[PDB]
């Protein structure tokens, strides 16, 4: 009857999300601040009920959801639009109603529905019967409790905002556009993805990279970082010749792979060397250059045209 959704989450902080402090503010003000100081919302000023997160894929909308979930410390429920549909063709709404009930039970709750456009639009079959009735029930629930007394926040997600049912559109509050990250944001992402590896020269290199990286997503950035991080492994795998690093302060010998001409260049296999006594090469900028070369831009320009259309029409929007 229940169909269990988990609310205990990892530790993704506000600072792990680069950019749009105004959206962060909106999240804090819609969630944390209300809980903090409830007396702020006496009389005619009332908390947000709906927020749509939209834009290209890979931009940490899910990441943001995890971050809010970390920071809010209240019942955070999150669900796929596909999830909890039906079994015997027409038994669908019981679980929906029960779910909205469950949101009511533990105020202040947060519902995250991924890919809200999957339960949207009009033509037939599902939008004649099943997806019709389900969409309808959704609509009745969402404003049902929303206006007047509320303890739920609904967060939607969509990559295709332009296919969002007009009715649903008008039922839903606050649109937030997620633009591709700018110089600063990308730089910050690089700094996040520094890890333990020695960061060759300063942050100026990250600034350079951030500038060099144009139009890419969080996901893209992460992948390029991973790619660069495999390069020392690759190098190790390639070498026969290694050389000792270990100065007299160290306990035992410590070996890094090197060119055949090197002073103390011994030529056994990496497999023969123990994990501690192996010294991975540090990460230089050339590995990141290679990483960049390998992974071409992931983003077609033609999606941004529709995204920008939506932006001009609705955009940073209340609705």
């Amino acid at each position: 009857l229940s169909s269990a959704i988990l609310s205990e989450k990892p530790n993704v902080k506000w600072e792990d999300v680069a950019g749009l402090e105004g959206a962060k503010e909106a999240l804090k003000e819609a969630v944390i601040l209300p809980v903090k100081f409830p007396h702020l919302f006496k009389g005619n000023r009332k908390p947000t009920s709906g927020i749509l997160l939209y834009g290209p894929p890979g931009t940490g909308k899910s990441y943001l959801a995890k971050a809010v979930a970390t920071e809010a410390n209240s019942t955070f429920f999150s669900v796929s639009s596909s999830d909890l549909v039906s079994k015997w063709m027409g038994e669908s709404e019981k679980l929906v109603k029960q779910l909205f009930a469950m949101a009511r039970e533990n105020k202040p709750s947060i519902i995250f529905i991924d890919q809200v456009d999957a339960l949207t639009g009009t033509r037939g079959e599902g939008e004649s019967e099943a997806s019709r009735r389900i969409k309808t029930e959704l609509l009745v629930q969402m404003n049902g409790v929303g206006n007047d007394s509320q303890g739920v926040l609904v967060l939607g997600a969509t990559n295709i905002p332009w296919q969002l049912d007009s009715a649903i559109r008008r039922r839903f509050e606050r649109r937030i556009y997620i633009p591709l990250p700018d110089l600063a944001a990308r730089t910050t992402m690089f700094e996040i993805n520094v890890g333990d590896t020695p960061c060759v020269l300063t942050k100026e290199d990250y600034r350079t990279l951030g500038a060099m990286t144009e139009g890419y997503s969080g996901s893209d950035i992460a992948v390029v970082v991973k790619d660069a991080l495999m390069q020392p492994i690759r190098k190790i795998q390639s070498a026969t010749h290694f050389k000792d690093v270990s100065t007299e302060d160290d306990e035992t010998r410590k070996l890094t792979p090197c060119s055949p001409g090197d002073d103390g260049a011994i030529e056994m296999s990496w497999t023969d060397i123990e994990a501690d006594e192996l010294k991975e090469p540090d990460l230089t900028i050339k590995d990141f250059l290679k990483a960049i070369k390998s992974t071409r831009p992931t983003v077609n320009e033609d999606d941004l045209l529709k995204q920008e259309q939506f932006t001009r029409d609705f955009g940073q929007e209340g609705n």
């Binding site: 402090e21 105004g22 110089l183 600063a184 730089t187 910050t188 700094e191 942050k203 100026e204 600034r207």
Partner: protein, 54 residues
């Protein structure tokens, strides 16, 4: 109240510019929080230029 349509639209326009400057300032602050000096300098400079134009 001294042209409630036209002058008020101009006022709104100016407020939008001011808002943009505020956003720039915020960006600069975030950059400094990550010790990203040149970017902060850029953002502050761009804000100040618009201030000087206003």
């Amino acid at each position: 109240k001294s042209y409630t349509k036209d002058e008020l639209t101009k006022i709104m326009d100016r407020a939008s510019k001011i808002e943009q400057i505020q956003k720039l300032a915020k960006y600069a602050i975030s950059a400094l929080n990550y010790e990203d000096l040149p970017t902060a300098k850029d953002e502050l400079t761009k804000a100040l230029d618009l201030l000087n134009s206003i």
